[PDB]
Design a protein around this ligand. Structure first.
Ligand code: CL
Ligand code: CL
Ligand code: ZN
Ligand code: ZN
Lengths: 21, 30, 30, 21
């Protein structure tokens, strides 16, 4: 999920925006 | 998990700022 | 507005620690 | 929903546990 995506690699601001809703 | 638990704390801060009024959802799994 | 925006930062910070595996959905518009 | 609740007055961790998913 977000942890696997963004704790193993740097997520841009727009990649984090997917989890907003 | 200590590395990722610390990492998740900044994700929660990051999500709150970027999402804001829209809100967000944190699902620790996998 | 800013104070509750400042306060909301600590709430999601607190929700991350308390909920743990449960996770949460932060929604300010309610 | 919690902002009008836990920012108007302090909430214990038990009250915050209700907002857990
Ligand atoms: Cl850290
Ligand atoms: Cl503050
Ligand atoms: Zn840290
Ligand atoms: Zn502060």
């Amino acid at each position: 999920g977000i942890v696997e995506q963004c704790c193993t690699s740097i997520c841009s601001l727009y990649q984090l925006e997917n989890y907003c809703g | 998990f200590v590395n990722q638990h610390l990492c998740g704390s900044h994700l929660v801060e990051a999500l709150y700022l970027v999402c804001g009024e829209r809100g967000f959802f944190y699902t620790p799994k996998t």
